[PDB]
Amino acid sequence: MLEQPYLDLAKKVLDEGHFKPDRTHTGTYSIFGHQMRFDLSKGFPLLTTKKVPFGLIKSELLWFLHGDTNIRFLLQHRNHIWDEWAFEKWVKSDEYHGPDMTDFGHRSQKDPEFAAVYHEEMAKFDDRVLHDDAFAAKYGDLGLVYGSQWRAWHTSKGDTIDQLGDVIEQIKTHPYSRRLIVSAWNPEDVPTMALPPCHTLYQFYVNDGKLSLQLYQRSADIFLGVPFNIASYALLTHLVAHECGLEVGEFIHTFGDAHLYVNHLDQIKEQLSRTPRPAPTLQLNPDKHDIFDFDMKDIKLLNYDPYPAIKAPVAV
Amino acid sequence: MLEQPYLDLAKKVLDEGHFKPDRTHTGTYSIFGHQMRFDLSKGFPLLTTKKVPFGLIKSELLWFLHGDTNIRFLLQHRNHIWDEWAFEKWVKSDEYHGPDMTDFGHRSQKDPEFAAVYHEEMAKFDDRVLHDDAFAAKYGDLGLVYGSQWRAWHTSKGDTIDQLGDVIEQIKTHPYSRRLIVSAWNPEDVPTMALPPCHTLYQFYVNDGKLSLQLYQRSADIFLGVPFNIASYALLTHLVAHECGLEVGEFIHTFGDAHLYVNHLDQIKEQLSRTPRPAPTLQLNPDKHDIFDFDMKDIKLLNYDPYPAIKAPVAV
Ligand SMILES: O=C1OC(c2ccc(O)cc2)(c2ccc(O)cc2)c2ccc([N+](=O)[O-])c3cccc1c23
Ligand SMILES: O=C1OC(c2ccc(O)cc2)(c2ccc(O)cc2)c2ccc([N+](=O)[O-])c3cccc1c23
Numbered sequence: 001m002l003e004q005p006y007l008d009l010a011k012k013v014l015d016e017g018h019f020k021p022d023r024t025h026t027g028t029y030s031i032f033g034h035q036m037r038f039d040l041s042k043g044f045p046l047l048t049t050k051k052v053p054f055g056l057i058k059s060e061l062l063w064f065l066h067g068d069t070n071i072r073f074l075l076q077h078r079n080h081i082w083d084e085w086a087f088e089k090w091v092k093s094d095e096y097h098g099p100d101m102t103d104f105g106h107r108s109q110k111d112p113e114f115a116a117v118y119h120e121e122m123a124k125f126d127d128r129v130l131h132d133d134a135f136a137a138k139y140g141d142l143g144l145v146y147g148s149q150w151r152a153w154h155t156s157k158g159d160t161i162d163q164l165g166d167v168i169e170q171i172k173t174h175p176y177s178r179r180l181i182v183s184a185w186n187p188e189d190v191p192t193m194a195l196p197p198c199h200t201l202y203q204f205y206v207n208d209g210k211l212s213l214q215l216y217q218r219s220a221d222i223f224l225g226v227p228f229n230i231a232s233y234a235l236l237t238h239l240v241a242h243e244c245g246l247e248v249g250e251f252i253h254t255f256g257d258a259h260l261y262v263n264h265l266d267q268i269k270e271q272l273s274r275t276p277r278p279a280p281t282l283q284l285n286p287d288k289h290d291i292f293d294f295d296m297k298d299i300k301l302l303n304y305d306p307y308p309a310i311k312a313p314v315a316v
Numbered sequence: 317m318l319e320q321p322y323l324d325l326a327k328k329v330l331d332e333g334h335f336k337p338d339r340t341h342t343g344t345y346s347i348f349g350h351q352m353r354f355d356l357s358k359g360f361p362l363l364t365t366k367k368v369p370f371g372l373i374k375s376e377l378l379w380f381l382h383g384d385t386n387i388r389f390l391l392q393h394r395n396h397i398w399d400e401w402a403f404e405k406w407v408k409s410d411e412y413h414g415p416d417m418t419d420f421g422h423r424s425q426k427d428p429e430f431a432a433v434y435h436e437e438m439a440k441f442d443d444r445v446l447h448d449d450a451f452a453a454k455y456g457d458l459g460l461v462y463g464s465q466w467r468a469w470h471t472s473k474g475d476t477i478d479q480l481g482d483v484i485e486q487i488k489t490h491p492y493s494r495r496l497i498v499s500a501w502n503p504e505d506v507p508t509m510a511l512p513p514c515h516t517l518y519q520f521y522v523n524d525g526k527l528s529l530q531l532y533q534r535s536a537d538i539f540l541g542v543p544f545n546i547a548s549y550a551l552l553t554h555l556v557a558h559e560c561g562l563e564v565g566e567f568i569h570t571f572g573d574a575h576l577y578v579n580h581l582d583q584i585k586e587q588l589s590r591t592p593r594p595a596p597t598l599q600l601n602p603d604k605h606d607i608f609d610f611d612m613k614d615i616k617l618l619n620y621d622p623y624p625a626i627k628a629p630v631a632v
Pocket of ligand 2: 397400401404421510511537540541630631
């Protein structure tokens, strides 16, 4: 089925993966150099062999398209994928007056009742981002994140490049250009960043009316991360196409380091013993055509009848 | 043999390539999304099924390592690969007082005796870059080119990042980092550049002592360009390794748009009917270990017993 390329990837890193200890204490198995191909005309590549929450992919992607870098938008949609990046700087500030929270994510896994200490201080940080504007703009805004690097790159002489907006015009007036590229990698910010972009750089392609997108991901997390990653991009391709009045073609995923954290082995193995069902379909509001102004309800997923979710501890 | 992945690529774009007219009048056949894998322990991937001049790959690469952007180094080595980029700006200047040379490369192909007009003005431009320092610094220096984008990126606040030098230290003190990446793509310069980087971005990888490098090339030219491209990178991997005291592993080539200009069909077909010979070997001066200071004679190619060269008109 459509998601086969993903499953073949895991069956692969298991079989051929060189053991590679890393940044965190949880070790991995990793490979260098992989490419996946998904024909978007056979259905939106959302996994059926495991329940991936589509809703969160939308909430995040539209955040990106909006040039947004403030977590509030996410919290205001129940999305909590970037909390830790901001909360981190909040526990560091000489304004924050509460518990230790030193490299917290790890203590919450070896969790004494301190997990509730964490989720407690998190609950307040979240409420204060929603309701207190001043707090939201100060500690909610990440600054360097996809939304801005895509749609607000800063030049040497004080301005801001809307990379995506520009490339979209290029697709429209120069669809065959071999330069339809957007990058999230900036050599000047990378030496000090927390999480330098994993989804490093992407390229569009137009042929016989069909849009195709290749994504270079220097880092991947096969069990937890990849299923989402595939989705944001299959989705981003459709949006780009919807706007450009183009049909949809393929999504070619490229990997630098693709890995399986050692404590996801069993879960991934158990997933491999699941036969996939027919892939879902996507419905993009046919009246709206300028995706930047798109909102949640302009994206629909049909026939997503996945198997249940697979609980797997986060790697830290 | 070792170069098989290249041959399979051409046999492929022929078989599956969608016809795609482009920037130039010479049309192409192109595909989106390809990856090649070369095990550098079976020999340096220089084509035997066609005589690729290794010498030029060296002269250019060391130019890069030197942070050099001035053509003089090349002309002073018989390398003429970047002439046109500079000469172009020379024929444009209100100092240049000679023939028209309007988009010249094309007239030199539909060449009236004007080809000699071109090569005439070129002969003077070249001599004046070698012997006249002031002219060399003014019209020889390209400014935005690999040597500087690799080893002299400019920040917003006035300075310069030695990307490569830095990442090399990273390999040495943090070999497993999944961030060993260097980019030649800068969103701010790309909207006006002549030739924005084809070799867009590359990543290193260390596992079990072996160094591996993946290269994302948004644009490739299967007949003329690719054979060189593979070489510069197989070479760059060895150098990086020589310095880091690491063994050599693989060179994974990744392609965005890979194409065969319609007027290289016959030549490539004729090449496909050639059986490859055992791959050559590379000898890197064992006493020198800081590649930046490397010079031509510190790189040796052995057993390169290729077939003859294949003349094919340049695409314009
Ligand atoms: O290595 C990570 O890092 C972050 C992370 C790291 C430290 C921290 O205190 C908070 C979050 C991460 C950080 C910033 C980002 O831009 C994206 C991810 C992370 C967030 C969410 C998930 N997940 O599983 O959903 C993650 C899964 C694997 C690895 C990371 C990971
Ligand atoms: O499309 C090209 O462009 C350049 C080019 C374009 C216009 C011009 O007046 C002079 C040169 C090129 C330009 C700048 C570069 O940084 C690299 C290549 C070029 C130089 C050398 C070769 N070859 O075959 O050796 C080329 C082969 C294919 C395409 C180009 C090509």
